[PDB]
Design a protein around this ligand. Structure first.
Ligand SMILES: COc1cc(S(=O)(=O)O)c2ccc3c(S(=O)(=O)O)cc(S(=O)(=O)O)c4ccc1c2c43
Ligand SMILES: [Zn+2]
Ligand SMILES: [Zn+2]
Ligand SMILES: [Zn+2]
Ligand SMILES: [Zn+2]
Ligand SMILES: [Zn+2]
Ligand SMILES: [Zn+2]
Lengths: 217, 212
Protein backbone atom coordinates (compact mmCIF):
# COMPACT_ATOMS: atom_id res chain seq x y z
CA UNK A 1 0.00 0.00 0.00
CA UNK A 2 1.09 3.59 -0.87
CA UNK A 3 0.44 5.75 2.13
CA UNK A 4 0.73 9.52 2.65
CA UNK A 5 0.12 10.14 6.31
CA UNK A 6 -0.44 13.74 7.19
CA UNK A 7 -0.11 15.46 10.54
CA UNK A 8 -3.14 16.29 12.71
CA UNK A 9 -5.27 19.40 12.91
CA UNK A 10 -3.66 22.69 13.81
CA UNK A 11 -5.14 25.62 15.61
CA UNK A 12 -2.74 28.48 15.07
CA UNK A 13 -2.83 32.21 15.72
CA UNK A 14 -3.13 34.94 13.03
CA UNK A 15 0.28 36.22 11.84
CA UNK A 16 2.19 33.14 13.02
CA UNK A 17 3.50 30.16 11.07
CA UNK A 18 2.46 26.51 10.86
CA UNK A 19 4.46 23.52 9.67
CA UNK A 20 2.76 20.29 8.65
CA UNK A 21 4.14 16.93 7.62
CA UNK A 22 3.40 14.11 5.18
CA UNK A 23 5.16 10.74 6.00
CA UNK A 24 5.28 8.39 2.99
CA UNK A 25 5.38 4.61 3.14
CA UNK A 26 4.89 1.74 0.75
CA UNK A 27 7.27 3.12 -1.88
CA UNK A 28 10.77 4.50 -2.38
CA UNK A 29 10.22 8.08 -1.19
CA UNK A 30 13.02 9.58 -3.26
CA UNK A 31 11.63 8.24 -6.56
CA UNK A 32 8.53 10.46 -6.73
CA UNK A 33 7.59 14.13 -6.80
CA UNK A 34 5.43 15.26 -3.88
CA UNK A 35 2.88 17.99 -4.58
CA UNK A 36 0.75 20.08 -2.22
CA UNK A 37 -2.88 21.21 -2.75
CA UNK A 38 -5.20 23.51 -0.71
CA UNK A 39 -8.92 22.94 -0.34
CA UNK A 40 -10.86 25.77 1.32
CA UNK A 41 -14.11 24.59 3.08
CA UNK A 42 -14.83 22.37 1.22
CA UNK A 43 -15.04 23.46 -2.39
CA UNK A 44 -12.16 24.67 -4.69
CA UNK A 45 -8.87 22.64 -4.99
CA UNK A 46 -5.77 24.81 -5.69
CA UNK A 47 -2.34 23.66 -6.65
CA UNK A 48 0.41 25.01 -4.32
CA UNK A 49 3.76 23.55 -5.48
CA UNK A 50 6.02 20.48 -5.60
CA UNK A 51 9.32 19.09 -4.36
CA UNK A 52 11.40 16.15 -5.67
CA UNK A 53 12.98 14.27 -2.74
CA UNK A 54 15.58 12.43 -4.90
CA UNK A 55 17.58 15.60 -5.69
CA UNK A 56 15.69 18.36 -3.83
CA UNK A 57 14.17 20.37 -6.75
CA UNK A 58 10.94 22.30 -6.21
CA UNK A 59 8.47 24.78 -7.83
CA UNK A 60 5.52 26.99 -6.88
CA UNK A 61 2.25 28.44 -7.92
CA UNK A 62 2.92 32.16 -8.18
CA UNK A 63 -0.09 32.65 -5.86
CA UNK A 64 1.66 30.77 -3.09
CA UNK A 65 5.09 32.18 -3.60
CA UNK A 66 5.22 34.28 -0.47
CA UNK A 67 2.97 31.99 1.60
CA UNK A 68 4.26 28.34 1.44
CA UNK A 69 7.66 26.65 1.83
CA UNK A 70 8.23 23.00 0.82
CA UNK A 71 11.01 20.86 2.33
CA UNK A 72 11.81 17.13 2.75
CA UNK A 73 13.62 14.90 5.25
CA UNK A 74 14.92 12.05 3.09
CA UNK A 75 15.99 9.75 5.99
CA UNK A 76 12.46 9.54 7.47
CA UNK A 77 10.61 9.72 4.12
CA UNK A 78 8.74 12.89 5.12
CA UNK A 79 7.66 16.03 3.19
CA UNK A 80 6.95 19.26 5.04
CA UNK A 81 4.97 22.37 4.18
CA UNK A 82 5.30 25.53 6.19
CA UNK A 83 2.78 28.33 5.82
CA UNK A 84 3.73 31.85 6.98
CA UNK A 85 1.97 35.11 8.02
CA UNK A 86 -1.28 33.28 8.68
CA UNK A 87 -4.66 34.87 8.03
CA UNK A 88 -8.17 33.39 8.08
CA UNK A 89 -7.82 32.84 4.28
CA UNK A 90 -5.31 30.22 5.24
CA UNK A 91 -7.99 28.24 7.15
CA UNK A 92 -8.34 25.19 4.85
CA UNK A 93 -7.56 21.58 4.34
CA UNK A 94 -4.10 20.91 2.93
CA UNK A 95 -3.22 17.74 0.95
CA UNK A 96 0.11 16.29 -0.09
CA UNK A 97 -0.22 14.16 -3.21
CA UNK A 98 2.17 11.92 -5.08
CA UNK A 99 2.68 12.50 -8.75
CA UNK A 100 2.18 9.31 -10.80
CA UNK A 101 3.02 8.57 -14.43
CA UNK A 102 6.47 8.75 -15.98
CA UNK A 103 6.84 12.48 -16.59
CA UNK A 104 6.41 16.07 -15.56
CA UNK A 105 2.81 16.08 -16.75
CA UNK A 106 1.92 13.13 -14.48
CA UNK A 107 -1.47 12.87 -12.71
CA UNK A 108 -1.79 12.55 -8.91
CA UNK A 109 -2.13 8.88 -8.11
CA UNK A 110 -2.35 8.95 -4.29
CA UNK A 111 -3.64 11.68 -2.02
CA UNK A 112 -2.62 12.29 1.61
CA UNK A 113 -5.04 12.08 4.56
CA UNK A 114 -5.30 15.92 4.77
CA UNK A 115 -4.29 18.41 7.48
CA UNK A 116 -6.96 20.93 8.62
CA UNK A 117 -5.58 24.35 9.61
CA UNK A 118 -7.76 26.67 11.67
CA UNK A 119 -6.41 30.25 11.93
CA UNK A 120 -7.84 31.82 15.06
CA UNK A 121 -7.06 33.77 18.28
CA UNK A 122 -9.70 31.81 20.17
CA UNK A 123 -8.84 29.43 23.03
CA UNK A 124 -9.39 25.69 23.15
CA UNK A 125 -12.81 25.04 24.82
CA UNK A 126 -14.13 21.64 25.99
CA UNK A 127 -17.71 20.78 24.87
CA UNK A 128 -20.72 20.29 27.15
CA UNK A 129 -22.44 16.97 26.33
CA UNK A 130 -26.19 16.59 26.90
CA UNK A 131 -28.22 13.41 26.63
CA UNK A 132 -31.45 13.82 24.64
CA UNK A 133 -34.09 11.27 25.84
CA UNK A 134 -37.57 11.16 24.25
CA UNK A 135 -40.39 13.53 25.41
CA UNK A 136 -44.41 2.85 18.13
CA UNK A 137 -41.97 0.26 16.72
CA UNK A 138 -38.89 2.49 16.84
CA UNK A 139 -37.31 4.93 19.31
CA UNK A 140 -35.02 7.85 18.55
CA UNK A 141 -32.53 9.27 21.07
CA UNK A 142 -29.96 12.05 20.77
CA UNK A 143 -26.70 13.55 21.88
CA UNK A 144 -26.07 17.31 21.88
CA UNK A 145 -22.46 18.60 21.92
CA UNK A 146 -22.28 22.27 22.57
CA UNK A 147 -19.68 24.94 23.04
CA UNK A 148 -16.39 23.46 21.82
CA UNK A 149 -13.44 24.85 19.86
CA UNK A 150 -11.71 23.99 17.74
CA UNK A 151 -12.93 21.17 15.46
CA UNK A 152 -13.13 18.19 15.54
CA UNK A 153 -14.91 16.10 18.09
CA UNK A 154 -15.58 12.41 17.64
CA UNK A 155 -18.94 11.00 18.70
CA UNK A 156 -19.86 7.35 18.87
CA UNK A 157 -22.69 5.27 20.31
CA UNK A 158 -21.92 2.45 22.72
CA UNK A 159 -18.14 2.72 21.95
CA UNK A 160 -18.97 2.27 18.26
CA UNK A 161 -20.87 -1.01 18.62
CA UNK A 162 -24.05 0.88 17.72
CA UNK A 163 -23.40 2.32 14.24
CA UNK A 164 -26.50 1.22 12.45
CA UNK A 165 -29.30 3.88 12.54
CA UNK A 166 -27.05 6.84 13.53
CA UNK A 167 -27.10 10.36 11.92
CA UNK A 168 -24.36 12.66 13.14
CA UNK A 169 -24.99 16.22 11.92
CA UNK A 170 -22.18 18.53 10.67
CA UNK A 171 -21.02 21.03 13.32
CA UNK A 172 -21.98 24.69 12.98
CA UNK A 173 -20.45 27.75 14.63
CA UNK A 174 -22.63 29.62 17.26
CA UNK A 175 -21.02 32.55 19.05
CA UNK A 176 -17.49 31.51 17.89
CA UNK A 177 -18.18 28.04 19.32
CA UNK A 178 -19.12 24.76 17.63
CA UNK A 179 -22.25 22.73 18.18
CA UNK A 180 -23.07 19.24 16.77
CA UNK A 181 -25.79 16.73 17.44
CA UNK A 182 -26.33 13.06 16.70
CA UNK A 183 -29.43 10.88 16.57
CA UNK A 184 -29.70 7.09 16.92
CA UNK A 185 -32.87 5.19 16.21
CA UNK A 186 -33.29 1.64 17.65
CA UNK A 187 -36.18 -0.81 18.01
CA UNK A 188 -38.63 0.03 20.85
CA UNK A 189 -37.72 -3.22 22.71
CA UNK A 190 -34.06 -2.32 22.89
CA UNK A 191 -33.88 0.80 25.08
CA UNK A 192 -34.15 1.49 28.07
CA UNK A 193 -33.75 -2.25 28.92
CA UNK A 194 -30.43 -2.11 27.04
CA UNK A 195 -28.37 0.90 27.89
CA UNK A 196 -27.35 3.39 25.15
CA UNK A 197 -24.53 5.77 25.78
CA UNK A 198 -23.15 8.70 23.72
CA UNK A 199 -19.30 8.79 23.73
CA UNK A 200 -17.64 12.18 22.94
CA UNK A 201 -13.97 12.97 22.63
CA UNK A 202 -12.46 16.44 21.94
CA UNK A 203 -8.70 15.75 21.62
CA UNK A 204 -7.73 19.44 21.62
CA UNK A 205 -8.98 19.68 25.23
CA UNK A 206 -8.00 16.07 26.20
CA UNK A 207 -11.60 15.53 27.19
CA UNK A 208 -13.67 12.34 26.94
CA UNK A 209 -17.24 12.11 28.29
CA UNK A 210 -19.67 9.19 28.19
CA UNK A 211 -23.30 10.17 28.57
CA UNK A 212 -25.92 7.55 29.23
CA UNK A 213 -29.32 8.42 27.86
CA UNK A 214 -31.85 7.82 30.73
CA UNK A 215 -35.67 7.83 30.48
CA UNK A 216 -37.12 11.27 31.52
CA UNK A 217 -39.52 12.04 34.37
CA UNK B 1 -4.07 30.44 -15.87
CA UNK B 2 -5.74 27.49 -17.59
CA UNK B 3 -9.40 27.76 -16.51
CA UNK B 4 -11.46 24.53 -16.23
CA UNK B 5 -15.28 24.99 -16.32
CA UNK B 6 -17.39 22.02 -15.33
CA UNK B 7 -21.06 21.47 -16.07
CA UNK B 8 -23.38 21.24 -14.55
CA UNK B 9 -22.47 22.37 -10.99
CA UNK B 10 -24.92 19.78 -9.62
CA UNK B 11 -26.20 16.75 -11.47
CA UNK B 12 -29.31 14.81 -10.43
CA UNK B 13 -29.46 11.25 -11.81
CA UNK B 14 -31.75 8.25 -11.10
CA UNK B 15 -30.19 4.95 -9.89
CA UNK B 16 -29.19 2.85 -12.87
CA UNK B 17 -29.09 5.81 -15.27
CA UNK B 18 -26.09 7.38 -16.92
CA UNK B 19 -24.31 10.37 -15.48
CA UNK B 20 -22.22 12.57 -17.77
CA UNK B 21 -20.15 15.48 -16.48
CA UNK B 22 -18.33 17.94 -18.80
CA UNK B 23 -15.13 19.83 -18.29
CA UNK B 24 -14.16 22.48 -20.80
CA UNK B 25 -10.53 23.93 -20.73
CA UNK B 26 -9.79 27.52 -21.85
CA UNK B 27 -7.01 26.16 -24.10
CA UNK B 28 -5.94 22.77 -25.41
CA UNK B 29 -4.36 20.62 -22.67
CA UNK B 30 -2.77 18.27 -25.25
CA UNK B 31 0.93 17.72 -25.71
CA UNK B 32 2.29 15.22 -28.20
CA UNK B 33 -1.29 14.17 -29.06
CA UNK B 34 -1.88 13.17 -25.43
CA UNK B 35 -4.59 14.91 -23.35
CA UNK B 36 -3.28 15.77 -19.90
CA UNK B 37 -6.66 15.86 -18.16
CA UNK B 38 -7.66 13.78 -15.09
CA UNK B 39 -10.71 13.03 -13.03
CA UNK B 40 -11.04 12.65 -9.25
CA UNK B 41 -13.84 11.62 -6.98
CA UNK B 42 -14.17 13.18 -3.55
CA UNK B 43 -16.49 11.79 -1.00
CA UNK B 44 -17.55 14.11 1.82
CA UNK B 45 -14.85 14.29 4.58
CA UNK B 46 -12.41 12.22 2.46
CA UNK B 47 -9.36 12.96 0.31
CA UNK B 48 -9.77 12.96 -3.48
CA UNK B 49 -9.21 9.68 -5.32
CA UNK B 50 -8.03 9.26 -8.95
CA UNK B 51 -10.60 7.69 -11.32
CA UNK B 52 -9.37 8.45 -14.88
CA UNK B 53 -5.97 9.70 -16.07
CA UNK B 54 -4.95 11.15 -19.47
CA UNK B 55 -8.63 11.60 -20.38
CA UNK B 56 -9.57 7.94 -20.77
CA UNK B 57 -7.35 5.59 -18.80
CA UNK B 58 -9.20 3.74 -15.99
CA UNK B 59 -7.13 3.70 -12.82
CA UNK B 60 -6.34 0.34 -11.25
CA UNK B 61 -9.11 -0.68 -8.80
CA UNK B 62 -11.76 1.80 -10.09
CA UNK B 63 -14.90 0.03 -11.39
CA UNK B 64 -15.41 -0.09 -15.20
CA UNK B 65 -18.69 1.77 -14.61
CA UNK B 66 -16.44 4.88 -14.83
CA UNK B 67 -14.97 6.08 -18.18
CA UNK B 68 -13.69 9.25 -19.76
CA UNK B 69 -13.24 10.68 -23.20
CA UNK B 70 -12.43 13.83 -25.14
CA UNK B 71 -9.38 15.80 -26.21
CA UNK B 72 -8.02 19.32 -26.62
CA UNK B 73 -10.36 21.50 -24.62
CA UNK B 74 -13.48 19.28 -24.17
CA UNK B 75 -13.74 16.31 -21.79
CA UNK B 76 -16.53 14.20 -20.30
CA UNK B 77 -16.67 11.70 -17.44
CA UNK B 78 -19.41 9.05 -17.67
CA UNK B 79 -20.82 6.80 -14.95
CA UNK B 80 -23.10 4.02 -16.16
CA UNK B 81 -25.03 2.72 -14.36
CA UNK B 82 -24.99 5.24 -11.47
CA UNK B 83 -25.10 3.51 -8.04
CA UNK B 84 -26.24 4.97 -4.67
CA UNK B 85 -22.67 5.17 -3.40
CA UNK B 86 -21.40 7.40 -6.32
CA UNK B 87 -22.62 10.46 -4.40
CA UNK B 88 -19.53 12.67 -4.24
CA UNK B 89 -18.00 15.72 -5.92
CA UNK B 90 -16.16 15.02 -9.13
CA UNK B 91 -13.24 17.19 -10.18
CA UNK B 92 -11.41 17.53 -13.51
CA UNK B 93 -7.76 18.68 -13.49
CA UNK B 94 -5.16 19.55 -16.15
CA UNK B 95 -1.42 18.89 -15.79
CA UNK B 96 -0.32 20.00 -19.25
CA UNK B 97 1.22 23.20 -17.90
CA UNK B 98 2.17 24.86 -14.63
CA UNK B 99 0.26 25.86 -12.62
CA UNK B 100 -1.93 22.75 -12.37
CA UNK B 101 -5.57 23.79 -12.16
CA UNK B 102 -8.79 22.00 -11.22
CA UNK B 103 -12.37 22.56 -12.20
CA UNK B 104 -14.85 23.94 -9.61
CA UNK B 105 -16.42 20.48 -9.14
CA UNK B 106 -19.69 18.74 -9.98
CA UNK B 107 -21.86 17.25 -7.18
CA UNK B 108 -23.67 14.07 -8.02
CA UNK B 109 -27.07 13.59 -6.38
CA UNK B 110 -29.33 10.66 -6.75
CA UNK B 111 -32.86 11.36 -7.83
CA UNK B 112 -35.29 9.12 -5.96
CA UNK B 113 -38.86 9.09 -4.70
CA UNK B 114 -40.15 11.75 -2.31
CA UNK B 115 -40.16 10.78 1.39
CA UNK B 116 -41.60 12.47 4.46
CA UNK B 117 -39.15 12.97 7.34
CA UNK B 118 -39.50 11.08 10.58
CA UNK B 119 -39.62 13.94 13.10
CA UNK B 120 -38.54 13.67 16.77
CA UNK B 121 -38.62 16.55 19.31
CA UNK B 122 -36.37 16.85 22.43
CA UNK B 123 -36.80 19.39 25.31
CA UNK B 124 -33.63 20.85 26.93
CA UNK B 125 -31.97 18.21 29.09
CA UNK B 126 -32.07 18.94 32.74
CA UNK B 127 -28.18 18.93 32.76
CA UNK B 128 -28.26 21.84 30.23
CA UNK B 129 -30.99 23.72 32.18
CA UNK B 130 -28.68 23.77 35.26
CA UNK B 131 -26.35 26.09 33.29
CA UNK B 132 -28.70 28.90 32.11
CA UNK B 133 -29.13 27.69 28.53
CA UNK B 134 -32.01 25.97 26.82
CA UNK B 135 -31.79 24.22 23.43
CA UNK B 136 -34.80 22.52 21.94
CA UNK B 137 -33.79 19.95 19.26
CA UNK B 138 -35.80 18.59 16.40
CA UNK B 139 -34.48 15.74 14.22
CA UNK B 140 -35.96 15.32 10.70
CA UNK B 141 -34.69 11.91 9.57
CA UNK B 142 -34.65 10.07 6.20
CA UNK B 143 -36.47 12.47 3.92
CA UNK B 144 -36.26 13.47 0.23
CA UNK B 145 -35.76 15.95 -1.48
CA UNK B 146 -33.19 18.00 0.47
CA UNK B 147 -35.15 21.36 0.42
CA UNK B 148 -37.49 21.14 3.41
CA UNK B 149 -38.98 24.00 5.48
CA UNK B 150 -38.67 23.72 9.28
CA UNK B 151 -40.67 26.07 11.47
CA UNK B 152 -40.59 26.58 15.23
CA UNK B 153 -43.54 27.82 17.23
CA UNK B 154 -43.63 28.76 20.94
CA UNK B 155 -47.13 28.73 22.37
CA UNK B 156 -48.27 28.57 18.69
CA UNK B 157 -46.38 31.73 17.64
CA UNK B 158 -43.61 31.47 15.08
CA UNK B 159 -39.99 32.07 16.11
CA UNK B 160 -36.69 32.72 14.30
CA UNK B 161 -33.68 33.35 14.92
CA UNK B 162 -31.77 31.40 17.64
CA UNK B 163 -32.54 28.71 15.01
CA UNK B 164 -29.67 26.62 13.61
CA UNK B 165 -30.23 23.97 10.92
CA UNK B 166 -27.68 21.32 9.84
CA UNK B 167 -28.14 18.82 7.00
CA UNK B 168 -26.25 15.57 6.50
CA UNK B 169 -24.90 14.80 3.02
CA UNK B 170 -26.99 12.42 0.91
CA UNK B 171 -26.96 8.92 2.42
CA UNK B 172 -24.78 6.51 0.38
CA UNK B 173 -27.19 3.58 0.95
CA UNK B 174 -30.84 4.91 0.71
CA UNK B 175 -30.30 8.29 -0.96
CA UNK B 176 -32.10 10.21 1.83
CA UNK B 177 -31.11 13.29 3.82
CA UNK B 178 -31.52 14.00 7.49
CA UNK B 179 -31.25 17.29 9.32
CA UNK B 180 -31.32 18.71 12.84
CA UNK B 181 -32.94 21.99 13.75
CA UNK B 182 -31.96 23.51 17.11
CA UNK B 183 -33.80 26.36 18.81
CA UNK B 184 -31.51 28.02 21.40
CA UNK B 185 -33.03 30.32 24.03
CA UNK B 186 -32.09 31.64 27.40
CA UNK B 187 -33.30 29.50 30.31
CA UNK B 188 -35.38 32.51 31.47
CA UNK B 189 -37.15 32.72 28.09
CA UNK B 190 -37.66 28.94 27.83
CA UNK B 191 -39.42 28.82 31.18
CA UNK B 192 -41.79 31.76 30.29
CA UNK B 193 -43.69 29.62 27.77
CA UNK B 194 -45.33 26.16 27.89
CA UNK B 195 -45.85 24.87 24.37
CA UNK B 196 -42.99 23.97 21.95
CA UNK B 197 -43.53 22.84 18.36
CA UNK B 198 -41.41 21.87 15.41
CA UNK B 199 -42.96 21.64 11.93
CA UNK B 200 -41.61 20.25 8.66
CA UNK B 201 -43.20 20.80 5.22
CA UNK B 202 -49.57 19.64 5.12
CA UNK B 203 -46.74 19.79 7.71
CA UNK B 204 -45.41 16.98 9.94
CA UNK B 205 -45.72 18.36 13.46
CA UNK B 206 -44.12 17.38 16.85
CA UNK B 207 -44.85 19.22 20.12
CA UNK B 208 -44.32 18.96 23.85
CA UNK B 209 -45.61 20.86 26.83
CA UNK B 210 -42.88 21.97 29.22
CA UNK B 211 -44.97 20.94 32.26
CA UNK B 212 -45.80 17.47 30.96
C1 LIG C 1 3.51 10.71 -27.81
O1 LIG C 1 4.08 10.85 -26.51
C2 LIG C 1 3.54 10.21 -25.40
C3 LIG C 1 2.79 9.01 -25.48
C4 LIG C 1 2.31 8.39 -24.30
S1 LIG C 1 1.45 6.99 -24.47
O2 LIG C 1 1.90 5.83 -23.70
O3 LIG C 1 0.03 7.29 -24.07
O4 LIG C 1 1.34 6.65 -25.90
C5 LIG C 1 2.52 9.06 -23.06
C6 LIG C 1 2.02 8.52 -21.84
C7 LIG C 1 2.27 9.15 -20.63
C8 LIG C 1 3.03 10.34 -20.52
C9 LIG C 1 3.25 10.96 -19.29
S2 LIG C 1 2.67 10.33 -17.83
O5 LIG C 1 3.22 8.97 -17.67
O6 LIG C 1 3.20 11.17 -16.78
O7 LIG C 1 1.24 10.25 -17.91
C10 LIG C 1 4.02 12.18 -19.30
C11 LIG C 1 4.55 12.79 -20.48
S3 LIG C 1 5.42 14.17 -20.30
O8 LIG C 1 4.86 15.26 -21.14
O9 LIG C 1 6.84 13.86 -20.52
O10 LIG C 1 5.43 14.68 -18.90
C12 LIG C 1 4.31 12.12 -21.72
C13 LIG C 1 4.76 12.66 -22.96
C14 LIG C 1 4.50 12.00 -24.14
C15 LIG C 1 3.77 10.81 -24.17
C16 LIG C 1 3.26 10.25 -22.99
C17 LIG C 1 3.53 10.92 -21.75
ZN1 LIG D 1 -5.12 32.11 -17.81
ZN1 LIG E 1 -0.70 26.67 -23.10
ZN1 LIG F 1 -30.56 7.79 7.38
ZN1 LIG G 1 -41.05 35.07 25.54
ZN1 LIG H 1 -46.05 32.12 26.06
ZN1 LIG I 1 -49.25 12.87 28.67
Amino acid sequence: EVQLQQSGPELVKPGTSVKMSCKASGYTFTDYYMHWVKQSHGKSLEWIGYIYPNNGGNGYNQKFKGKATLTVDKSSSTAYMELRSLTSEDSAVYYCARRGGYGSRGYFDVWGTGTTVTVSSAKTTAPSVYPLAPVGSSVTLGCLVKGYFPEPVTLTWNSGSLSSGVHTFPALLQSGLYTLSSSVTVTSNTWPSQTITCNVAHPASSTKVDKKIEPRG
Amino acid sequence: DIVLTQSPASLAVSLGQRATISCRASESVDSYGISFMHWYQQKPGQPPKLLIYRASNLESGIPARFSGSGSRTDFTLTIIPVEADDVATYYCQQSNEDPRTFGGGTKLEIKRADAAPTVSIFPPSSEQLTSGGASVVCFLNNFYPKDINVKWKIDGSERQNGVLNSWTDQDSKDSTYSMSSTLTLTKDEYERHNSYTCEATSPIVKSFNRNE
